[PDB]
Design a binder for these strands. Structure first.
Ligand SMILES: [Mg+2]
Length: 604
DNA sequence: CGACGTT
């Protein structure tokens, strides 16, 4: 791990020399460092170029501390770099490219040279290794503890924004970052080349996602804060009523939110035997315990209602109005592309993928999302996608025929399990088969179904036996995947995304069963994520080539909520439809139930 | 309720 060959650029002539080197440089790093953690309101501070291993350059453009000398104009430097950054033939490399690209696009410079991202490379190679962050990557691959931002800043309010930070420390840190990316690239890229499936997915599914991810995050979803600042008042009043009722039942004032106090007061005053126990050993008070106890006493019911209301209020109705970006008035999310192992995108700060649906008050919370003016929400959706991947990967004629004909999968499964035809499949049989399908997706055991269906576990096993006998190809494929995990350990999805299992041969019964379940459902969710990502890429290509009156705002799991102008709804819905069924060459069709509701809940 | 685990 070399160092000290780090030249910091203060004059534009050295910048010209560096760009002359860069335009002949095949691959090079790019790591813009910025004061603000935000990707939208942040103002750029400096850049970083590392054409050759150890040969890294930091280019300050605005430093705020006393006597920051010869600061190149942030506009002049970017104007001189526009031929380079906006070049397609120059392949770049970095970390979290949807951050650098967003920061650059703040100034109108649309970057186009992205080809490698160390985060994405580390994700594709071994998705269950570390956390895919520079600090972890450093020792995990290069075996070189790098300088963190904490040393320069210091935890707490004492932490310093990067812009006023002294020249030497900031420059050496950024150049070390750039240089590191190069070492990580030069080390991992041969490994990424040796793996054909991972190479395919990395080139075609993961990396073209970065520009559309940045565009989606910068577009942001619009919320009507008045709805939440109204609705929280009714939430507070209702929970106050629940407080009054609970303190009437118990005769004392306390906090329903606390769990230790709640279990103590409950199990000492009313004294029901603890049905279940927490993983920590204490008596458990989860929702099942709540409903079982509310079968007997009203205080469990009222505290369950308090939990239900308070969770949604505190998590959404209070946090979302706070997170509205004041500059543009739209909530901006950070889709972390590589954090979950399976492959799904997971929105963070705030979790837009975690908006309530099943509760009517959750329906109100989803109604809080609206359109600015003359616009209307289009909520794309894949219906029962996981079962479609199951049919494709099982090669079972029954499910393939059922999906090709287009009948509801749940009633068809119930018909094939119980014998009576699908038209006579009633509601209880229907959601019984629904539980069968979902559980088989997740790999759960018969006790789980006795819990999720309130039927004896013997009857659960009998029902799965009927299903398994009528669908032997699915079981054969699942056993093939289980066995494949033994000698390969990287049970793999369709498009080549892998998952290394360090728990397949753990020789422990507890871990291996969960490892087997993960091996079962890994191709499932992996294929679903790849299909969604490819649909995202195609739709983004359509918008960026045609520029219609549509803006993609969010990507929930198997959902692609848009925002269209009122007069476009007739044709753009059909166009995105066609773009999405033609997304992936899979035999079973990919049904897309496009809504066109005025608000997100209405479109849902 | 049945398979996994240990004294
Ligand atoms: Mg970076």
């Amino acid at each position: 791990g070399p160092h000290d060959n780090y030249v910091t650029i203060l004059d534009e002539e050295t910048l010209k020399a560096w760009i002359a080197k860069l335009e002949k440089a095949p691959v090079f790093a790019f790591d813009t460092e910025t004061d603000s953690l935000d990707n939208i309101s942040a103002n750029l501070v400096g850049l970083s170029f590392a054409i050759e291993p150890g040969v890294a350059a930091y280019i300050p453009v605005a430093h705020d501390y006393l006597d920051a000398p010869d600061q190149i104009s942030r506009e002049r430097a970017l104007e001189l770099l526009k031929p380079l950054l906006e070049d397609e033939k120059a392949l770049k490399v970095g970390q979290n490219l949807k951050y650098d690209r967003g920061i650059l696009a703040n100034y109108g410079i649309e970057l186009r040279g992205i080809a490698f991202d160390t985060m994405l490379e580390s994700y594709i190679l071994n998705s269950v290794a570390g956390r895919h962050d520079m600090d972890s990557l450093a020792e995990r691959w290069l075996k070189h503890k790098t300088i963190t931002f904490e040393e320069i800043a210091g935890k707490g309010k004492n932490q310093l924004t990067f812009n006023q930070i002294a020249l030497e420390e900031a420059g050496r840190y950024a150049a070390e970052d750039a240089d590191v990316t190069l070492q990580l690239h030069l080390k991992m890229w041969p490994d990424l080349q040796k793996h054909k499936g991972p190479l395919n997915v990395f080139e075609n599914i993961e990396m073209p996602l970065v520009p559309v991810l940045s565009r989606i995050e910068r577009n942001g979803v619009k919320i009507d804060p008045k709805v939440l600042h109204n609705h929280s008042e009714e939430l507070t009043l209702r929970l106050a009523e629940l407080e009054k009722k609970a303190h009437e039942i118990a005769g004392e004032e306390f906090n329903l939110s606390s769990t230790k106090q709640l279990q103590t007061i409950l199990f000492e005053k009313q004294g029901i035997k603890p049905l279940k126990k927490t993983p920590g050993g204490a008596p458990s008070t989860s929702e099942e315990v709540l409903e079982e106890l509310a079968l007997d006493y009203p205080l469990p019911k009222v505290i369950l209602e308090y939990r239900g209301l308070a969770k949604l209020k505190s998590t959404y109705t209070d946090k979302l109005p706070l997170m509205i970006n004041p500059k543009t008035g739209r909530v901006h999310t950070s889709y972390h592309q590589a954090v979950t192992a399976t492959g799904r995108l997971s929105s963070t700060d705030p979790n837009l993928q975690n908006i309530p649906v099943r509760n009517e008050e959750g329906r109100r919370i989803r109604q809080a999302f609206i359109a600015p003016e003359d616009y209307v929400i289009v909520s794309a959706d894949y219906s029962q996608i996981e079962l479609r991947i199951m049919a494709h990967l099982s090669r079972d004629k029954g499910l393939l025929t059922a999906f090709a004909e287009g009948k509801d999968i749940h009633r068809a499964t119930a018909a094939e399990v119980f014998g009576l035809p699908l038209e006579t499949v009633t509601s209880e049989q229907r959601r019984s088969a629904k539980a069968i399908n979902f559980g088989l997706i997740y790999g759960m055991s018969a006790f789980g179904l006795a819990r999720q269906l309130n039927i004896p576990r013997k009857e659960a096993q009998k029902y799965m036996d009927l299903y398994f006998e009528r669908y032997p190809g699915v079981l054969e494929y699942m056993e093939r995947t289980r066995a494949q995990a033994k000698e390969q350990g990287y049970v793999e999805t369709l498009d080549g995304r892998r998952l290394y299992l360090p728990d397949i041969k753990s020789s422990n019964g507890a871990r291996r069963a969960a490892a087997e379940r993960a091996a079962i459902n890994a191709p499932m969710q992996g294929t679903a994520a790849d299909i969604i990502k490819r649909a995202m890429i195609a739709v983004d290509a359509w918008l960026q080539a045609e520029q219609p009156r549509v803006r993609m705002i969010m990507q929930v799991h198997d959902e692609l909520v848009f925002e269209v102008h009122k007069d476009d709804v007739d044709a753009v819905a059909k166009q995105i439809h066609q773009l999405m069924e033609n997304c992936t060459r899979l035999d079973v069709p990919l049904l897309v139930e496009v809504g066109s509701g005025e608000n997100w809940d209405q479109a849902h």
